[model samples]
Target chain A: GHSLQDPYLNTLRKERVPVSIYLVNGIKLQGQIESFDQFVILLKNTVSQMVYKHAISTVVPSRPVRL
Target chain B: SLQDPYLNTLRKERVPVSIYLVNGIKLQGQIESFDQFVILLKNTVSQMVYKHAISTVVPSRPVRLP
Candidate 1:
């Protein structure tokens, strides 16, 4: 299967881009990507939030990262 | 790709869809584009919903993929 998910997230994590993550519940979380797996992502701001992928709606970077 | 053919069919056909999110929110739109992680849905506006957040996708009618 073709996978673009890993590369995109990896770039964001390595580059430490500030991100705005919109959740399905209409909540917005701001953080830099600390780590991620198939089902969860660790977002680091003042504290680290272990966010389930099932709760995420979108991820918008503060700035664009080269894909 | 597991999703490509299905989504591409929807996109190409401009099929209206009802997408249900895991949190029980529903979105109605036509699939405009998609990669592995997210799908761009177009209605009066465009919304990109992550694949992980989606629980179900129902077409306005059944689709028979070729």
Candidate 2:
């Protein structure tokens, strides 16, 4: 399939990569991907953050991510 | 994507817009191109902005697509 988002998230979930999710509102949230769907992501750190996809700007992995 | 037609219309018409990001940042430019994930906004430069970062797009005027 010619998908870019799903595989990337799945990889992060499976590999347990630490990520910095930058919100469009200029908030930098740090967490690991616990679960995700089309509309929201469950990000796990000390607490679980239910992040909406619409508010997200970027997802920066701590290390290089490969598919 | 549902957005493709609307974006294409804007691009084809060279419409100027005020693009608002979720952070309340306002970017002013004309639509150059777009895809499923990114939009190329052109003014002095072509900016590759992710769709997820966008909150609203206000065209200079109303857009009529045929």
Candidate 3:
């Protein structure tokens, strides 16, 4: 019979898993995206999916072509 | 690359104030006016996000303050 005074009560108690949720914003969208044209498309898609439920518009400024 | 991008953005935006938490208490004030607290928050956040090593770079431009 297991006694209540067992010091090794529940070996599972020694294990732990920490879970956290982070809401990171303004993360730079680089890599795989080649030109500014494609970049805008990808950014729009990403923001749309991430905040689709919310009524916030993602702003992207248009830049002139660099010589 | 030349400088800490977050600090650069903050400087460019003229956001002299920073909000942060200390000892389970939230606080907010100017960087210059509250130098000690500002430094403390900077150190804490930096340490917390050190592993991420994310650099935030943005073009320079003047923005209107609210």
Q: Which candidate number would show the highest lDDT if scored against the true structure?
A: 1
Clashing pairs in 3: none
lDDT of 1 by residue, A25-47 (tens): 88999999999998899999888
How many Å off is the CA of B42 in candidate 1? Answer: 11
lDDT of 3 by residue, B29-57 (tens): 31221121123223323322221222221
The CA lDDT of each predicted structure is 0.82, 0.78, 0.23
Q: What shift in Å separates residue B53 of candidate 2 from its native position after superposition? A: 1.4
User: Model 3: how many Å of interface RMSD?
Assistant: 12.4
Among these predictions, the greatest TM-score belongs to: 1
Better of 2 and 3 by TM-score: 2
How many angstroms is residue A32 displaced in model 1 relative to the true structure, after the best TM-score fit?
A: 0.5
lDDT of 3 by residue, A1-67 (tens): 3343121212211221111112134222322211111011111122111111011123222322111
Q: Name the runs in model 1 displaced over 4 angstroms.
A: B1-3, B9-37, B40-48, B55-66
* CAPRI grade, predicted model 1: acceptable
RMSD (Cα, Å) of model 1: 4.3
